[PDB]
Amino acid sequence: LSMVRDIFGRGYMDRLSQTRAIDYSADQATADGAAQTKLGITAIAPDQGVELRPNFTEADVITVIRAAYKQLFGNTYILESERVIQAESLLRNGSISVREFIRILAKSDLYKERFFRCTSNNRFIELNLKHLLGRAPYNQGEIAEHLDRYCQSGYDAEIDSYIDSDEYRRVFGENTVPYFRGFKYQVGQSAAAFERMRALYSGDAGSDTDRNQNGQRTELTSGLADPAQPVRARTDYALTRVDIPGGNGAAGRLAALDESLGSWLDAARDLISQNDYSQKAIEVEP
Amino acid sequence: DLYKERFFNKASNNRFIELNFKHLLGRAPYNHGEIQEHFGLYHKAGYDV
Amino acid sequence: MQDAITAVINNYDVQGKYLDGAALDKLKAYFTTGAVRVRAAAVISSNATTIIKEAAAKALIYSDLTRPGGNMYTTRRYAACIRDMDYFLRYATYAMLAGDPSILDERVLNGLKETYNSLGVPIAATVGGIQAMKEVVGGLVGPDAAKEASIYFDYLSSGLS
Amino acid sequence: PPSYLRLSEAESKLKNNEISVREFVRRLGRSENYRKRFFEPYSSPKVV
Amino acid sequence: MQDAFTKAIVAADLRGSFLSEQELNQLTNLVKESNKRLDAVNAITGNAAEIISDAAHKLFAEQTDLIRPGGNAYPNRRMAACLRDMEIILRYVSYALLAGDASVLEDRCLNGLKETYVALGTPTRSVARAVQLMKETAIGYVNSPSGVTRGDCSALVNEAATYFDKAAASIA
Amino acid sequence: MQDAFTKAIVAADLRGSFLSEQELNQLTNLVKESNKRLDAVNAITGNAAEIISDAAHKLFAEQTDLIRPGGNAYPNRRMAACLRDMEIILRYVSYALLAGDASVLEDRCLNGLKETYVALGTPTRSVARAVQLMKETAIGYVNSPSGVTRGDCSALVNEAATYFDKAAASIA
Amino acid sequence: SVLTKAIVNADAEARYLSPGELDRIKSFVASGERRLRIAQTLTEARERIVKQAGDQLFQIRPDVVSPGGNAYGEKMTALCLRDLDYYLRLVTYGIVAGDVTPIEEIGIIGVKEMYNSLQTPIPAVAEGVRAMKNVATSLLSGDDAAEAGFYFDYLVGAMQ
Amino acid sequence: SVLTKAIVNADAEARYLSPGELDRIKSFVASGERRLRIAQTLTEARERIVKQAGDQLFQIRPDVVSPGGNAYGEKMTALCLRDLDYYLRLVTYGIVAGDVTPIEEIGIIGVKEMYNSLQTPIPAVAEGVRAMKNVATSLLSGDDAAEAGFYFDYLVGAMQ
Amino acid sequence: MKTVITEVIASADSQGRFLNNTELQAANGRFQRATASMEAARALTSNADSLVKGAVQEVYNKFPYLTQPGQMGYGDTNQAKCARDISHYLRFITYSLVAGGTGPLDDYIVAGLREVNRTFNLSPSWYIEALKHIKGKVGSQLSGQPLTEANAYIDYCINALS
Amino acid sequence: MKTVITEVIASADSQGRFLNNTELQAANGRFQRATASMEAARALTSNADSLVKGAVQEVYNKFPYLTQPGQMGYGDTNQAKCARDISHYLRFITYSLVAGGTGPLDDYIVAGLREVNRTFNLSPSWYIEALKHIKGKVGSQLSGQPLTEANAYIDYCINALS
Numbered sequence A: 001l002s003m004v005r006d007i008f009g010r011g012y013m014d015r016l017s018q019t020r021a022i023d024y025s026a027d028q029a030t031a032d033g034a035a036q037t038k039l040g041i042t043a044i045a046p047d048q049g050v051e052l053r054p055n056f057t058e059a060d061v062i063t064v065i066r067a068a069y070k071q072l073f074g075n076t077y078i079l080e081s082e083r084v085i086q087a088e089s090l091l092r093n094g095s096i097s098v099r100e101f102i103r104i105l106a107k108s109d110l111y112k113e114r115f116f117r118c119t120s121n122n123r124f125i126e127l128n129l130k131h132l133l134g135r136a137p138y139n140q141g142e143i144a145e146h147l148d149r150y151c152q153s154g155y156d157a158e159i160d161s162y163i164d165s166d167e168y169r170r171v172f173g174e175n176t177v178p179y180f181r182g183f184k185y186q187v188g189q190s191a192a193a194f195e196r197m198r199a200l201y202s203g204d205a206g207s208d209t210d211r212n213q214n215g216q217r218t219e220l221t222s223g224l225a226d227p228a229q230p231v232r233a234r235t236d237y238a239l240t241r242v243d244i245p246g247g248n249g250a251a252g253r254l255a256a257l258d259e260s261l262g263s264w265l266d267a268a269r270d271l272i273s274q275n276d277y278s279q280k281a282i283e284v285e286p
Numbered sequence B: 001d002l003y004k005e006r007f008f009n010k011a012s013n014n015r016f017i018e019l020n021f022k023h024l025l026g027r028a029p030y031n032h033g034e035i036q037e038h039f040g041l042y043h044k045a046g047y048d049v
Numbered sequence C: 001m002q003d004a005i006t007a008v009i010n011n012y013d014v015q016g017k018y019l020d021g022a023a024l025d026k027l028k029a030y031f032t033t034g035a036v037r038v039r040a041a042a043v044i045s046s047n048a049t050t051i052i053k054e055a056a057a058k059a060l061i062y063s064d065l066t067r068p069g070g071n072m073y074t075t076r077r078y079a080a081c082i083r084d085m086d087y088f089l090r091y092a093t094y095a096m097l098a099g100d101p102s103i104l105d106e107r108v109l110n111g112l113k114e115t116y117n118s119l120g121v122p123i124a125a126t127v128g129g130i131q132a133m134k135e136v137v138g139g140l141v142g143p144d145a146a147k148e149a150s151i152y153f154d155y156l157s158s159g160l161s
Numbered sequence D: 001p002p003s004y005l006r007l008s009e010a011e012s013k014l015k016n017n018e019i020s021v022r023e024f025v026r027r028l029g030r031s032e033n034y035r036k037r038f039f040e041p042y043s044s045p046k047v048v
Numbered sequence E, F: 001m002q003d004a005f006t007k008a009i010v011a012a013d014l015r016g017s018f019l020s021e022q023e024l025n026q027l028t029n030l031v032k033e034s035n036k037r038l039d040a041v042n043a044i045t046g047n048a049a050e051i052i053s054d055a056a057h058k059l060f061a062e063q064t065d066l067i068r069p070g071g072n073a074y075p076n077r078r079m080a081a082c083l084r085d086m087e088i089i090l091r092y093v094s095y096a097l098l099a100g101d102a103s104v105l106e107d108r109c110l111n112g113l114k115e116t117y118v119a120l121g122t123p124t125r126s127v128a129r130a131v132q133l134m135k136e137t138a139i140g141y142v143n144s145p146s147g148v149t150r151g152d153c154s155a156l157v158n159e160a161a162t163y164f165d166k167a168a169a170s171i172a
Numbered sequence G, H: 001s002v003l004t005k006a007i008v009n010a011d012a013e014a015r016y017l018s019p020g021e022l023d024r025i026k027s028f029v030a031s032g033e034r035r036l037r038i039a040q041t042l043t044e045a046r047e048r049i050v051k052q053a054g055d056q057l058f059q060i061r062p063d064v065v066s067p068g069g070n071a072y073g074e075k076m077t078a079l080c081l082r083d084l085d086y087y088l089r090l091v092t093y094g095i096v097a098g099d100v101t102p103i104e105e106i107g108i109i110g111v112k113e114m115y116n117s118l119q120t121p122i123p124a125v126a127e128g129v130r131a132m133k134n135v136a137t138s139l140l141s142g143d144d145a146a147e148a149g150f151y152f153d154y155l156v157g158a159m160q
Numbered sequence I, J: 001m002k003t004v005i006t007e008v009i010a011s012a013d014s015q016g017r018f019l020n021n022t023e024l025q026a027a028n029g030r031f032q033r034a035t036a037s038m039e040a041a042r043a044l045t046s047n048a049d050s051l052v053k054g055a056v057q058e059v060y061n062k063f064p065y066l067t068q069p070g071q072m073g074y075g076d077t078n079q080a081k082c083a084r085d086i087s088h089y090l091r092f093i094t095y096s097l098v099a100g101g102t103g104p105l106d107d108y109i110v111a112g113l114r115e116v117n118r119t120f121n122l123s124p125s126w127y128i129e130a131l132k133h134i135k136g137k138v139g140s141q142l143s144g145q146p147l148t149e150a151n152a153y154i155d156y157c158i159n160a161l162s
C-alpha cells in the first residue's frame, strides 16, 4: 500500500498522464524514390544548360563547343575534317555569341546534308524544334507556319526564324547553349508536349540520322492533325501498352459493402464532428 | 489416328481389347480366351490385322 | 512420426546396418543446428497470437472472405479459421524442431485437401494465410533460424495446392 | 469447462464424422487431462 | 481555339449557311447572362489559391498513402508537381467558363493527360478525386461571394461542374 | 544517376528508414576497397585506345565479312562508327566501375541500343562479340598493371565483367 | 425457431409431439404476425438506431475512440457501427422466428475468439447493444418494446 | 517438479522410469545449487523488481492507471503490484522445481475466469510479467538469466 | 543524385571522355572523407528519436503561441506531422552524409520546398529553429571532422530555407 | 503430341514392331534440323514483345474500324486479349520449332479453333493479318534454314485459319 502512498499519488495527479503524442509509423506501400527519371531521362530530368561567360580561358570554350555539337547533331560522330573550324575560332576570340555560333552551325552544309536533304520537311521542322528550341511542336498549325515560311523565304530564313524568336531569347539568351526543355511543364505549354518530346528524344544513345525504318519518318506528325494519340516509346518504358490494368486497392471492396457502410460512414463522420473524445469520464456506476 | 490416339495410344492391351469389343461389337468380353486370342494376333500380325 | 535422428535410424534398421560415417555425418548436421531451433520455437510460441493476428490482417480479413457469402463470415467460422491457423503455426513449430516434415503429413495434411473441398473451405486463401504467418515468423526469429522455420510453412502450403 | 482440457482437433474429428462418438469418448478417457484429475490421487481401487 | 460563338459559326459554315435564328438567340442569351458569367469566372480567380489548397488538404486527409514514402505526392518535389497540376486544371476550367465552351480544356489540358499519368505511375483515381474536391469548393465560391447582386447562377454552376466533370472523367 | 551509395539510400527511403547497420557496413566495405577500385578504373582509362584497337583487330580477324563490301564495318565511314561505339561502351563501363553501379551504363548507353542496331541493320551478334573482346583485354589490364601494390582484385574484376556482360546481353 | 427447438427435442425421445409441445407452437403462430411486424418496424429505422446507438456508446465509453482504443479513427469507427448494424439485423431475425436459434450460430458462438483476436473490448460491444435497445425501444409500443427487449438483453447476455 | 512429472508418466504407464527419465533427473539435480542461487538472488531483490516492472508497465499503459482503468487509484495500484509480487514468487518456485506444476495450480489454471470477473485486462498483466523479466534478468549472469527467463516467458504464455 | 562520384562522371560524359586523373583525384576526396561522414551518420542515426523530440519541442518553446487552440502546433495531428517532418530532415541529412553530397537533400527536400510550404502555410522559421536546435545538441555527440560534416549539412538546410 | 519422334514411335507400336533403320533415319532428320529450328526459336523468343505489339497494331491499321467505340478493337480489355492471343500463337510457334513438329500447334490452337472463334465473334482475318505481319518482320531477324522453319510454322497457322 505504502509503496503506494510514497512512490505513487502526485505521480498520478496528471503527471501520470501528460499525454500520448508522437510517432509517425510507415507510409505508402510501394516503391519509386525519385525514379520516374529512369525513363532514360535521368541525365535529363532538368539537364544542366551550359552558360559561357567572358574572360573564359579555353577549357570552358571547348566544353561549350562540345555541348553545342552534342545538341545540334545529337550523338552522331563528326569527323575533325567536318568541324566548322572558322566558327570555333570566332567563338574562341569572343567575336560571336553562343547564339550566333549556333546560327553558323545550323546554316552549315553539314547540317543541310544530315537533316534537310535526308528527311521530309515536316520531320526537318520537328528536328529544328528539338535541336534549336529544345522542345516538340505544340500544334499542327506551328508545323504549317514553319513550312509556309520555308516555302516562301527558303532554308536560311527558316533557321533565322527559330533563333530570332522571342522564345529563344527568353530561355537561352545570347550565352547559353540550347538544352532539352520538353520534360518540364512551362506556363502556356500543352500537356501533349511532354509525350511528344519523349517520342522525339530516344535517350542519350539516340541518333536522329538513323536510316532504319522509323528515323526518317515523322514520329510526331502522324498524331498531330487530330484527336488520336501519344508517342512511340520505342516502347519499353511506356510499359508497352500496359492496357492500364487499374491500380485499385483491396479497399475497393469496402467501398462496395459500406456503400451501405457509407450510409453509416456519414453517420460516423457526422457524429465524430459533433463529438470529441477527449472525454473519458465514461462510467456512472450507480 | 482418331481411334488410335484415343483408345490405343495411351492404354494397355487389356483396355484396348475391351474397348474394341465395346466400340465395334457393342458388347463386353465374355471370357479370358477372347482376350488371350486377340492379343496373340496383335503381337503376331500388328494392329491392322 | 519421425525426426531427423529417427529418420536415419529407421533407414538403417531396414537394412540392419550399424550407423556408419555417412549416417553419423547426417546426425551431426542436425545436432549442430539444434540450439537455434529451440530459440526459434520459444519466439514463435510466445508470439503465437500476434503472428496469427498480423497474418490474418495481411492475407484474410478486410475482404469478401469476412463478408456475407464468404467462408469466414459468422463468428463461428471466423473462430474455426483462426483456430486452424493456430494448428498450422503450432505443427510447423514441431516440424522445425524435429527437422522432419513427416508430422505435417501424418497429423495435418492427410485428407485435409478433400475435407476443405467438402466444406467449401477456400484452399488458395488458406495458403496465403500460411505464407503470411511465414513472413511474420521470419522477421521475429532472425538470420539464425529464418530459412529453417520457413521450409515447413512451405511444406504445408504445397501440401494443400 | 472454462475453455479447458477440451479437444482442439478433437471437436473437428467428432463432428466431421471422421470419428464416431464412441471413439471420441475413448480418446477423452486416455489423456492427460483425465489422468491427473481422476487417477492422480488414489490407491489402486477407487480409481477403478 | 473555340468559344460558344465560334462553335456556332463552325456548325453554320458546315451547312454553308448564315447563322440560324435558332442559333442567333441562343447566343443572344449568352450575352444576356454574361455579367453573371464574369462574376463566376471572377469567383474562381479570386480564390484560386484557397481552392487548390483546400482541395489539397482534403485529398491527403483522405489518401494518407500519397504522403508516405513512395506515395505519389512524396517527397517535396512530387507534392509541388501535384499542387502545380491542380492549378493547371483549375486554370483551364476557368478559361472554359469564360469561353462557354470546353474545347480549350480538352485540347490544351485533357488531351493525352491520362496516358501521361499512367506512364508516370501517377494514380489517376487520386487525381480525379482532387478535381472533384476543387469542383466542390470552386462552386461554393461561385454561389456565395462578396456583394454580388442577388440572382440565380445555377445554370452557370452546372456548366462549371461539367467542366470539372469532363476533366475527372477524362483522367480517372 | 546512381552510384552504390545512392542506391542504398533510395532503397532505405522506400522503407521510410535511416540506413540499416546491414547497409552501412556494405558501404564501409566499398570505401575499404576504393583504392583498388581507382586502380581498376585507371587501368581501363590508361589503355582505352589499345583495348579498343586490340578488340577491333581481333573482331575483324574472326568476322572477315564485316570488312567486305556488303559488310557493316565497310567503308571507312562505317568502320569509324563501329570504332566509335566500341569506345562509347568501354567508356560507360568504366563509369559504372567508378560508381559501383550499372545504372549509368543501362540508362545512358544500353537503353534502346539493340533496337537502334536492328533499325540500322548492324549485326548485334558481332557487336556483342566486340564487347566480349573488350572485356578480355580490359580485365587483362586490371589484373597486370604498372607497379601497383600486390593484392587481390578478383572481386572488382568480376564486377567489371558483369558490366561487360550486361552490355553484351542487352545487345545480342 | 420455436418450431426447430420443439422438434429437435421431440425426435430425441423417439416420441411424438405432445400436447404441450404444440401449445407453444400455437402461441408462436399468433405471436409471429406481431413478431413479423416488430421486425419490420425495427428494419425501417435501422440507420437511425445504429447512428444514435453509436453516439450513446462513445459518450459512455470514449476510451474505445481514443489513441489506444480498438475503434480509434474514422474507419475503425465505421466498422464498429457496421457491427452494430449486424447485431440489430440478427435481433430482427430472433424476434420473427420466436426463438433465438439462427442468431446464435451467426453471431455469438465464436464471438469471443473473433473479438479477442481483433483485440476488441467485448464488454463495450455489450454496451453498444444496450444503446440500441434504448433507441429501438423508443419506437415501439410498451408491449412490443418488451418483446423486442428480451432479444437485446440476450445478445448482451451472450457477450459475457 | 521434474521428479513429479517423470514419475506420473511412469505410474500411468505402469512402469519403472526410462533411461531418458533417469537422465533428466540426474541433469536436473546437478543444476540444484545453481537453480537455488537464481531463486536467492531474485528473492533478495523482490521489492526492487516489482517496482521497476510497475514503472515499465504504467509508461507502456498509462490508461490502466486512468479513469476507466482496472488499476486506477492508489489502492487499485497497490493490489496490482501485489499481484506482480505473487507471480515473481511463483517464478522462483518454478525455477527450483524445474517445471511448472506448482506455478500452474497456484496461478494460471483459473486465472482467466478470476481476472475476467474482476475485469482485469489480462494482456497487460502479461506485460507486467515481461517488465519483471527485464529487471530480474539484469541481476543475473547470462547463463542464469536465460534459465530464469524461460519461466517468465511461460507465465507470459499462459496468460494468453 | 548529386555525389562527388556522379558529378565527375557527369562531367566526363558530357565531354565524351574517359575519367582522367582530375576526376579520380576528386573521387579519392569523397572516399577519404567517408569515415568522418559515416561517424556523423551513425551518431545522428541512433540519437534520431531524441534529436527529433528536442527540435519539435523547441519549435513550440520559441513560438509559444503555436500550441494554443486554433493554431498549427495544436492537436495530435499537427504535432505528429511536425515530428515526422523534422525526422524527414534528419533522415536526409544522414543520407547526404553517407552519400558524399547534397543530392538526397536537393532531390527530396529542397526541390519544391517553398511551393509546398507556401500552399500549406508552413513557416520556414520553425524549420530553421528546429535545425538550429539540432545543431546545438550535435555539438556534444560529435567533434572534429564528423561534426564539421554534420554542420555542413544542417547549415545547408538552413540556407535552403532562407 | 506430334513430333518426328512420336510419329515414328506411333507407327512402330501400331505394327507391334521395334524401331528399324527407316524409323531411325527419320529421327536423324529431326535431330539434324534442330539447329536451324532452335535459332528461329531464340530469335522469335527475344523479339516476342515487339512482334506481338507490331502485329496487334497491324490488325487495327488493316481494319481501322475495329478501334471505334462499340467495336471489338476498343477498350483496354479487347486490346489486351488481342495482344495475349497473338502472343499465344507466337508461343506455340516457338514450341513447334523446338519440338520438331506441329504438335503444339495442333493440340493447343488448331483443335477447336473455329468453334471457339465462331462463338466469340472473332474473325480469322485479323489473325491471318497478324501472322502475315509477323512473317514480314521475321524476314530480317532470320535467314536461311531458320527463316524457312519460322515460315513453315507461320504459314501453317495461316492455313489452319483459312
Ligand SMILES: CCC1=C(C)/C(=C/C2=NC(=C\c3[nH]c(/C=C4\NC(=O)[C@H](C)[C@H]4CC)c(C)c3CCC(=O)O)/C(CCC(=O)O)=C2C)NC1=O
Pocket (backbone or CB within 6 Å): A085, A086, A087, A088, A089, A090, A091, A092, A093, A095
Ligand atoms: C572569315 C574566315 C576567317 C578568318 C580569316 C578567321 C581568322 C581568325 N583567326 C583567329 C585566331 C588565330 N589566328 C592565328 C594565326 C596566326 N598566328 C601566327 O602567329 C601567325 C602569324 C598566323 C598564322 C599565319 C592564331 C595563332 C590564332 C589564335 C590566337 C589565340 O587564341 O591566342 C580567330 C579567333 C577565333 C579562333 O581562334 O578560332 C579568327 C576569327 N576566322 C575566320 O572565320
Ligand SMILES: CCC1=C(C)/C(=C/C2=NC(=C\c3[nH]c(/C=C4\NC(=O)[C@H](C)[C@H]4CC)c(C)c3CCC(=O)O)/C(CCC(=O)O)=C2C)NC1=O
Pocket (backbone or CB within 6 Å): A036, A183, A184, A185, A189, A190, A191, A192, A194, E059, E066, E072, E073, E078, E079, E081, E082, E083, E085, E086, E088, E089, E108, E109, E110, E111, E113, E116, E117, E120, E122, E126, E127, E128, E130, E131
Ligand atoms: C494539358 C494540361 C496538362 C495537365 C493536366 C498535365 C498533367 C501532368 N501532371 C503531371 C505530374 C503530376 N501531377 C501530380 C498531381 C497530383 N498528385 C497527387 O497526389 C494529387 C492526387 C494530384 C493533385 C491534385 C503529381 C504529384 C505529379 C508528379 C508525379 C511525379 O513526378 O512523381 C505530368 C508529368 C509532367 C510533370 O510532372 O510536369 C503531366 C503531363 N500536364 C499538362 O500539360
Ligand SMILES: CCC1=C(C)/C(=C/C2=NC(=C\c3[nH]c(/C=C4\NC(=O)[C@H](C)[C@H]4CC)c(C)c3CCC(=O)O)/C(CCC(=O)O)=C2C)NC1=O
Pocket (backbone or CB within 6 Å): A075, A076, A077, A204, A205, A206, A207, A208, A209, A210, F066, F071, F072, F073, F078, F079, F081, F082, F083, F085, F086, F088, F089, F108, F109, F113, F116, F120, F122, F123, F126, F127, F130
Ligand atoms: C549513348 C551512346 C551511344 C551509342 C552506343 C550509339 C550507337 C549508335 N551507333 C550508330 C551507328 C553504327 N554503329 C556501327 C557499329 C558496328 N558496326 C559493325 O559492323 C560492328 C558489329 C559494330 C562495331 C563493333 C556502325 C557500322 C554504324 C553505322 C551504321 C550505318 O550508318 O550504316 C548510331 C547511328 C548514328 C551514327 O551513325 O552516328 C548510333 C546512335 N550512339 C550513341 O549516342
Ligand SMILES: CCC1=C(C)/C(=C/C2=NC(=C\c3[nH]c(/C=C4\NC(=O)[C@H](C)[C@H]4CC)c(C)c3CCC(=O)O)/C(CCC(=O)O)=C2C)NC1=O
Pocket (backbone or CB within 6 Å): B011, B012, B013, B014, B035, B036, B037, B039, B040
Ligand atoms: C500393352 C502391352 C501388353 C503387355 C505387357 C501385355 C501383358 C499380358 N500378358 C498376358 C498373359 C501372360 N503373360 C505371361 C508371362 C509370364 N509368365 C511367366 O511365368 C513369366 C514370369 C512371364 C514371362 C517373363 C504368361 C504365362 C501369360 C498367360 C497366362 C495364362 O493365360 O495363364 C495377358 C493376357 C492376354 C494374353 O494372354 O494374351 C496380357 C494382356 N499385354 C499387352 O497388350
Ligand SMILES: CCC1=C(C)/C(=C/C2=NC(=C\c3[nH]c(/C=C4\NC(=O)[C@H](C)[C@H]4CC)c(C)c3CCC(=O)O)/C(CCC(=O)O)=C2C)NC1=O
Pocket (backbone or CB within 6 Å): C061, C062, C063, C066, C067, C072, C073, C074, C075, C078, G064, G069, G070, G071, G072, G076, G077, G079, G080, G081, G083, G084, G086, G087, G106, G107, G118, G120, G121, G122, G124, G125, G128
Ligand atoms: C454477423 C456476425 C459477425 C460480426 C459481429 C463480425 C464482426 C467483425 N468486426 C470486425 C472488425 C472491427 N469491429 C470493431 C468493433 C468495435 N470496436 C470497438 O472498440 C467497439 C467495442 C466495437 C463497436 C461497437 C472494430 C473497431 C474493428 C476493426 C478492428 C481491426 O481492424 O483491427 C471484423 C474484421 C473486419 C472485416 O473483415 O469485416 C469482423 C469480421 N463479423 C461477423 O461475421
Ligand SMILES: CCC1=C(C)/C(=C/C2=NC(=C\c3[nH]c(/C=C4\NC(=O)[C@H](C)[C@H]4CC)c(C)c3CCC(=O)O)/C(CCC(=O)O)=C2C)NC1=O
Pocket (backbone or CB within 6 Å): C060, C065, C070, C071, C072, C077, C078, C080, C081, C082, C084, C085, C087, C088, C107, C108, C115, C119, C121, C122, C123, C125, C126, C129, D008, D009, D010, D011, D012, D013, D015, D016
Ligand atoms: C489437428 C489438425 C487439424 C486441422 C488443420 C483441422 C481443420 C478443420 N477445419 C475445419 C473447418 C473449417 N476450417 C475453416 C478455415 C478457414 N476458413 C476460411 O475462410 C479460411 C480460408 C480458413 C482459415 C485460414 C472454416 C471456416 C471451417 C468451418 C466450415 C464449416 O462451417 O463447417 C474442420 C471441420 C470440423 C470443425 O469445424 O472443426 C476441420 C477438421 N482439423 C484438424 O484436426
Ligand SMILES: CCC1=C(C)/C(=C/C2=NC(=C\c3[nH]c(/C=C4\NC(=O)[C@H](C)[C@H]4CC)c(C)c3CCC(=O)O)/C(CCC(=O)O)=C2C)NC1=O
Pocket (backbone or CB within 6 Å): E032, E033, E035, E036, E037, E038, E039, E040, E042, E142, E143, E144, E145, E148, E149, E150, E151, E152, E153, E156
Ligand atoms: C470586371 C469584369 C466584370 C464583372 C465581374 C461584372 C459583373 C456584373 N455582375 C452584374 C450582375 C449580377 N451578377 C450576378 C451574379 C450572382 N448572383 C448570385 O446570387 C450569385 C452568388 C452570383 C452568381 C455568379 C447576378 C445575380 C446579377 C444581377 C443580374 C444580371 O445583371 O444578370 C452586373 C450588372 C450590374 C449589377 O446588377 O450589379 C455587372 C456589371 N461586370 C464586369 O464588367
Ligand SMILES: CCC1=C(C)/C(=C/C2=NC(=C\c3[nH]c(/C=C4\NC(=O)[C@H](C)[C@H]4CC)c(C)c3CCC(=O)O)/C(CCC(=O)O)=C2C)NC1=O
Pocket (backbone or CB within 6 Å): F032, F033, F035, F036, F037, F038, F039, F040, F042, F142, F143, F144, F145, F148, F149, F150, F151, F152, F153, F156, I021, I024, I025, I028
Ligand atoms: C589518383 C586516384 C587514385 C588511385 C589510382 C589510388 C591508388 C591506390 N592504390 C592503393 C593500393 C592497392 N591497389 C591495389 C590494386 C591492385 N593490386 C593488384 O595486385 C592488382 C593488379 C590491382 C587490382 C586493381 C592493391 C592490391 C593495393 C593494396 C591494398 C589496398 O590498399 O587496398 C593505394 C594505397 C597505397 C598503396 O598501398 O600503394 C592507393 C592510394 N589512389 C588514388 O587517389
Ligand SMILES: CCC1=C(C)/C(=C/C2=NC(=C\c3[nH]c(/C=C4\NC(=O)[C@H](C)[C@H]4CC)c(C)c3CCC(=O)O)/C(CCC(=O)O)=C2C)NC1=O
Pocket (backbone or CB within 6 Å): E057, E060, E067, E073, E074, E075, E076, E079, I056, I059, I066, I072, I073, I074, I077, I078, I079, I081, I082, I083, I085, I086, I088, I089, I108, I109, I116, I120, I122, I126, I127, I130
Ligand atoms: C520527403 C521530405 C518531405 C517534407 C519535408 C514534407 C513536408 C510536408 N509537411 C506537410 C504538412 C504539415 N507540416 C506541419 C508542420 C508542423 N506543425 C507543427 O506543429 C510544427 C509547427 C511544424 C513542425 C516544425 C503541419 C502542422 C502540417 C499539416 C498541414 C496541413 O495539412 O494543414 C505536408 C503536406 C502533406 C501532409 O499533410 O503530410 C508536406 C509535404 N513532406 C515531405 O515529403
Ligand SMILES: CCC1=C(C)/C(=C/C2=NC(=C\c3[nH]c(/C=C4\NC(=O)[C@H](C)[C@H]4CC)c(C)c3CCC(=O)O)/C(CCC(=O)O)=C2C)NC1=O
Pocket (backbone or CB within 6 Å): J056, J059, J066, J072, J073, J074, J077, J078, J079, J081, J082, J083, J085, J086, J088, J089, J108, J109, J116, J120, J122, J126, J127, J130
Ligand atoms: C491456347 C491458345 C488459345 C487461343 C488462341 C485463345 C483465343 C481466345 N480468344 C478469346 C477472346 C478474345 N479474343 C479477342 C481478339 C481480338 N480483339 C482485338 O482487339 C483484336 C481484333 C483481336 C486480336 C487480333 C477479343 C476482343 C476477345 C474477347 C471476346 C469476348 O469475350 O467477347 C477467347 C475467349 C475466352 C476469353 O475471353 O479469353 C479465347 C479462348 N484462347 C486460347 O486458350
